[PDB]
Structure formats: C-alpha cells, structure tokens
Amino acid sequence: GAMGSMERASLIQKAKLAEQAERYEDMAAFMKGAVEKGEELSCEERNLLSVAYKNVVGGQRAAWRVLSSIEQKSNEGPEVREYREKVETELQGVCDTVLGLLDSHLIKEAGDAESRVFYLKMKGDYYRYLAEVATDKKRIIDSARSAYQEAMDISKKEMPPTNPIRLGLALNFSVFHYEIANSPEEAISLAKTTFDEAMADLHTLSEDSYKDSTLIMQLLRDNLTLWT
Amino acid sequence: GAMGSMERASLIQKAKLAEQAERYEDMAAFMKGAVEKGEELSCEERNLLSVAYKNVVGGQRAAWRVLSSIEQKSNEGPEVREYREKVETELQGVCDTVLGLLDSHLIKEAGDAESRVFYLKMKGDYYRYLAEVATDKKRIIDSARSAYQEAMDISKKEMPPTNPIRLGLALNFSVFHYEIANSPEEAISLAKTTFDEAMADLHTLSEDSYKDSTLIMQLLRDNLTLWT
Amino acid sequence: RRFSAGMR
Amino acid sequence: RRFSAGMR
Numbered sequence: 001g002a003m004g005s006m007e008r009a010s011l012i013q014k015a016k017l018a019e020q021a022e023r024y025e026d027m028a029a030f031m032k033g034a035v036e037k038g039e040e041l042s043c044e045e046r047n048l049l050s051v052a053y054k055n056v057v058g059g060q061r062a063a064w065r066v067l068s069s070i071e072q073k074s075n076e077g078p079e080v081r082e083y084r085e086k087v088e089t090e091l092q093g094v095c096d097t098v099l100g101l102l103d104s105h106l107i108k109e110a111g112d113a114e115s116r117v118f119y120l121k122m123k124g125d126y127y128r129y130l131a132e133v134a135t136d137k138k139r140i141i142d143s144a145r146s147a148y149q150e151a152m153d154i155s156k157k158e159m160p161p162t163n164p165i166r167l168g169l170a171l172n173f174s175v176f177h178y179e180i181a182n183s184p185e186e187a188i189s190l191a192k193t194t195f196d197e198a199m200a201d202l203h204t205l206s207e208d209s210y211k212d213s214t215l216i217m218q219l220l221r222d223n224l225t226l227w228t
Numbered sequence: 229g230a231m232g233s234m235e236r237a238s239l240i241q242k243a244k245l246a247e248q249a250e251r252y253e254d255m256a257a258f259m260k261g262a263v264e265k266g267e268e269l270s271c272e273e274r275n276l277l278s279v280a281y282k283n284v285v286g287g288q289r290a291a292w293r294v295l296s297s298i299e300q301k302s303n304e305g306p307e308v309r310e311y312r313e314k315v316e317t318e319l320q321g322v323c324d325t326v327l328g329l330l331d332s333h334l335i336k337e338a339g340d341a342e343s344r345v346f347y348l349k350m351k352g353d354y355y356r357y358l359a360e361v362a363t364d365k366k367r368i369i370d371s372a373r374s375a376y377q378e379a380m381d382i383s384k385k386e387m388p389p390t391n392p393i394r395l396g397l398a399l400n401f402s403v404f405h406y407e408i409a410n411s412p413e414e415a416i417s418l419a420k421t422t423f424d425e426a427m428a429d430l431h432t433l434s435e436d437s438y439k440d441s442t443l444i445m446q447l448l449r450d451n452l453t454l455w456t
Numbered sequence: 457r458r459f460s461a462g463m464r
Numbered sequence: 465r466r467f468s469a470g471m472r
C-alpha cells in the first residue's frame with residue numbers, strides 16, 4: 001500500500017484534515033491505509049472511513065446517473081456508452097475496495113455489536129451500490145440483503161431502537177427494499193416500525209442523544225411521505 | 229498521452245458529458261487530449277478547457293487555503309505541513325500542465341486576437357495561482373503581470389470594452405494587482421475604468437450581449453465595493 | 457429523491 | 465472574498 005510507510009496516527013490526523021479541506025479522495029486513501037494497519041477502528045474512526053467513501057462513491061453515483069439518463073435518451077456514436085462504462089468501472093472499483101477492507105478483515109475482527117453492526121451495514125450499502133449499476137445482479141442483491149439482515153438481527157438484540165447506527169441501518173435497508181429489491185411494502189413496513197419504535201424510546205434519552213436519533217427519524221419520515 | 233488514441237471529436241464530446249456530470253478532472257483530461265491533437269480550439273472549446281481546469285485547480289486552491297490556515301494556527305508534528313505540501317505540489321503540477329499546453333503551442337498558433345487574448349489571460353491566471361502558494365515568487369509575479377499586460381494591450385486594440393473575455397481579463401488582472409502584487413490602487417484604477425468604459429458601450433449591444441457584459445460588470449462592482 | 461443515511 | 469472571472 002502507498003500508505004504503508006506512514007504512521008497510523010498520522011493517517012488518522014491527515015484523514016481529518018482532508019475532511020476539513022473537502023478532499024474526500026485523499027480522505028478515503030488515508031483511511032484505507034489506516035484500516036490496513038490491522039488495528040480496530042474507534043467509533044470516530046469508523047465514521048471517518050464511512051464519510052470518506054460515502055463522498056467518493058457519491059460523486060461517482062451522481063455522475064453515473066447523469067450519464068445513464070443521457071445514454072437512455074439517445075436510445076429512444078459509442079461515446080456516451082463508453083464514458084458511462086468508464087465511470088461505472090471506477091465506481092465498481094471503489095465498491096470492491098471497500099468490500100475488501102470489510103472482508104479482510106474489519107468484520108471478523110469486530111469484537112463488538114456496535115463495531116460489527118457498523119461494518120455489516122457498510123457491506124450492505126456497497127453491495128447496494130454495485131446493484132444500482134448491475135445488469136450477477138440477482139447475486140449482488142442477495143449479498144446486500146444478507147449483510148443488511150445480519151446487521152438487523154444483531155442490532156435488535158444488542159442496541160436500543162434509538163441508536164443512530166441502528167436507525168441508519170434500517171433507513172438504508174428500507175431504501176434497498178424499495179428501489180433495489182422491488183419490495184416497496186417491505187420498505188414501508190421497515191421504515192414505519194423503525195420510526196415508531198424509536199419515537200417510543202425517545203423519553204429515555206439525553207438532549208444530545210435525542211438530537212442524534214431525531215435527525216435520522218426525519219429521514220425515515222421524508223421517505224414514508226414519498227412512498228405513501 | 230493517455231488520450232492519444234481517442235478521436236478529437238470524441239474527446240470534445242466526452243468533455244461535455246463530463247461537465248454535465250460534474251466530473252471536472254475527467255473534463256480536464258479530455259480537453260488536455262483535445263489540445264494535444266494540435267488543432268485550434270473553437271470559442272466553445274476554449275471555454276470547455278477553461279472551465280475544466282478552473283474547477284480542478286479551484287478545489288485545490290480552496291483545500292490549500294484551508295490547510296495553510298490550520299498550519300499557521302499551529303505556529304502561533306509534521307503532518308499539517310506535510311499534507312499542505314502534498315496538495316500544494318499537486319496544485320503546482322496542474323498549473324504547470326496548463327502552462328505547458330499554452331506554451332506548446334496554443335498561444336503561438338492562436339492566429340486571432342480573440343483566441344490569443346483568451347490564452348494569454350489563462351497564462352496570467354495560472355501563474356497567478358502559482359504565485360498564491362509561492363514563497364522564485366517575484367519571478368512568477370512578473371510572468372503573470374507580463375502575460376496579463378500583453379493580453380490587455382491586444383484586447384484594447386482589437387476588442388470593444390464590453391467583450392466578455394476582455395472584461396474577464398481586466399477583472400482578474402485587477403485581482404492580481406490587489407492581492408498578489410500589493411498594488412491595491414492599480415487594482416481599483418483598473419476595475420473602475422473597465423467598469424466605466426463598459427457601461428458607456430452598453431448602448432451598442434443586443435439584449436443577449438448586454439446580459440453577457442453586465443454579468444461580468446457585476447463582479448467588477450462587487451470588488452470595488454470591497455476595496456473602497 | 458429518497459434519503460439514505462449518507463444524505464442527511 | 466473578492467471575485468475572479470472564474471467565480472461568477
């Protein structure tokens with residue numbers, strides 16, 4: 001790895017600077033190196049990894065969707081298809097890289113429910129991103145579904161219904177159900193039960209945790225308002 | 229060049245898709261390949277080149293300024309300096325690349341005042357970007373000043389005071405004077421004379437050209453409001 | 457466009 | 465922050 005000669009602590013520090021600078025490709029490269037040191041990631045460091053790749057693949061996804069729509073319009077020279085494939089291939093590479101970090105060996109070394117759920121959610125997310133562009137598609141969908149489901153099983157056993165990672169997990173699993181798995185009823189069922197069970201637990205929370213949970217509840221709210 | 233195997237027309241087409249996708253690094257790479265085909269760039273294609281590198285170096289510049297401020301605060305480990313240098317070096321590389329396209333051979337093959345002024349303005353801009361991070365600085369400032377001045381000489385002879393490239397040229401030369409050359413009076417003098425002479429020429433313009441010119445006049449306006 | 461956890 | 469032509 002190109003980051004193998006840098007100290008773990010220096011990589012984490014520079015990942016934070018990269019975030020402040022909105023240099024998310026640098027951020028991801030630094031966090032990739034941090035992961036490959038072989039030591040667990042703290043909660044803060046898990047968020048750094050997630051935010052970094054969210055922004056990198058996010059730009060790829062938005063670019064892909066622009067190109068894919070233009071491509072479809074021109075089917076109602078090869079350059080539009082060629083460039084969509086270029087972005088698509090670069091997007092799949094990023095997803096394969098994140099999934100490699102998780103399988104080697106973040107998930108197996110996650111000796112916590114909190115840490116393990118976080119990584120399993122990430123596994124579902126980046127198989128979901130591969131499914132968005134897949135046309136093996138069925139097999140990718142099952143990999144995401146399975147990663148999401150195991151995270152759900154653990155989260156329900158080990159974490160309260162207001163935990164932000166659990167809420168973010170159910171949010172994204174509901175989106176998977178709605179737009180990837182062709183299961184809009186599952187998506188609705190999941191979003192509302194998650195919302196309702198979180199609201200019934202808010203009375204147990206501090207003003208700060210309250211803010212954390214209600215911020216993700218708003219996203220469940222907006223989706224249900226769109227789907228029903 | 230990695231783009232040497234692609235048709236000029238395909239590179240231009242994909243540069244346009246890249247813009248729609250907000251993939252500006254791709255855009256610049258495509259336009260770099262287009263330039264290296266050795267044929268002149270149309271007005272539209274000159275704008276594609278300029279917008280592409282504006283966005284790439286723009287992100288580098290904003291990141292540099294974030295890092296440089298953090299670095300200065302910590303002087304009121306080496307990681308902040310190290311990463312600022314990483315971004316700085318990558319920024320200088322981009323500026324060197326644009327300046328190489330201009331010197332080999334966009335400027336000498338520009339057989340128009342319109343085309344030649346455009347490229348000379350670009351030369352001033354990217355030497356200005358090198359000056360922003362330089363600490364050889366005097367020599368870079370003279371290179372920008374000289375490129376800007378020759379563009380001004382041509383523009384005054386060959387183009388009306390409302391021409392958008394001429395207005396954009398004077399705008400950026402005024403900024404050079406204000407924040408790079410320590411000449412805030414030159415900057416003010418240049419911005420107001422450009423503004424005033426453009427306003428006195430607006431009566432000659434179509435509704436469309438009017439819009440073009442007044443859009444850059446607003447920027448001269450905002451700067452004068454800041455400086456006086 | 458629906459929200460995912462990475463869009464808040 | 466002042467405007468340059470690349471900020472309109």
Ligand SMILES: N=C(N)c1cc(-c2ccccc2)c(CNC(=O)c2ccc3c(c2)CCO3)s1
Nearest residue numbers: 016019043044045047048051215216461463464
């Ligand atoms: N450097 C970063 N980006 C983060 C660092 C930490 C952290 C710091 C210290 C201890 C533990 C964690 C984060 C915790 N996570 C959030 O605060 C959060 C995440 C997603 C989200 C919102 C907020 C609002 C809507 O969507 S984020």
Ligand SMILES: N=C(N)c1cc(-c2ccccc2)c(CNC(=O)c2ccc3c(c2)CCO3)s1
Nearest residue numbers: 043044047163164165168209212213215216461
């Ligand atoms: N058990 C809890 N409730 C938490 C414990 C900690 C923690 C752990 C170790 C060190 C410091 C803090 C949390 C930090 N906060 C987040 O990670 C966070 C917050 C908001 C949010 C997201 C993530 C995703 C979307 O919105 S939360």
Ligand SMILES: N=C(N)c1cc(-c2ccccc2)c(CNC(=O)c2ccc3c(c2)CCO3)s1
Nearest residue numbers: 188189191192195196220221222223224225228
């Ligand atoms: N297929 C379903 N389950 C639904 C069917 C209807 C309905 C029934 C009759 C008339 C019109 C609509 C629903 C109404 N909308 C909600 O109940 C709702 C509930 C909780 C919640 C949000 C929205 C957002 C935040 O959390 S939901």
Ligand SMILES: N=C(N)c1cc(-c2ccccc2)c(CNC(=O)c2ccc3c(c2)CCO3)s1
Nearest residue numbers: 244247271272273275276279443444469471472
């Ligand atoms: N693909 C692009 N980005 C462009 C393509 C063309 C073009 C197309 C056909 C013929 C000639 C030129 C452009 C002309 N230039 C502008 O319209 C322009 C430039 C800077 C600016 C504003 C407007 C508003 C504020 O700052 S831009």
Ligand SMILES: N=C(N)c1cc(-c2ccccc2)c(CNC(=O)c2ccc3c(c2)CCO3)s1
Nearest residue numbers: 271272275391392393396437440441443444469
């Ligand atoms: N002689 C003129 N006045 C123009 C002639 C042409 C042209 C030439 C060949 C083909 C098609 C059009 C123009 C296209 N427009 C721009 O290039 C433009 C417009 C607004 C603007 C900027 C640039 C920079 C900031 O704001 S302008």
Ligand SMILES: N=C(N)c1cc(-c2ccccc2)c(CNC(=O)c2ccc3c(c2)CCO3)s1
Nearest residue numbers: 416417419420423424448449450451452453456
């Ligand atoms: N050092 C100078 N040249 C100036 C000194 C003063 C001044 C004098 C007395 C009291 C307060 C201020 C100026 C006033 N401001 C303008 O005249 C002005 C003119 C044209 C214009 C804009 C602004 C923006 C768009 O185009 S300018």
Ligand SMILES: [Cl-]
Nearest residue numbers: 082083086242
């Ligand atoms: Cl391509």
Ligand SMILES: [Cl-]
Nearest residue numbers: 014310311314
């Ligand atoms: Cl570095």
Ligand SMILES: [Mg+2]
Nearest residue numbers: 184185188189
């Ligand atoms: Mg129903």
Ligand SMILES: [Mg+2]
Nearest residue numbers: 412413416417
């Ligand atoms: Mg004065």
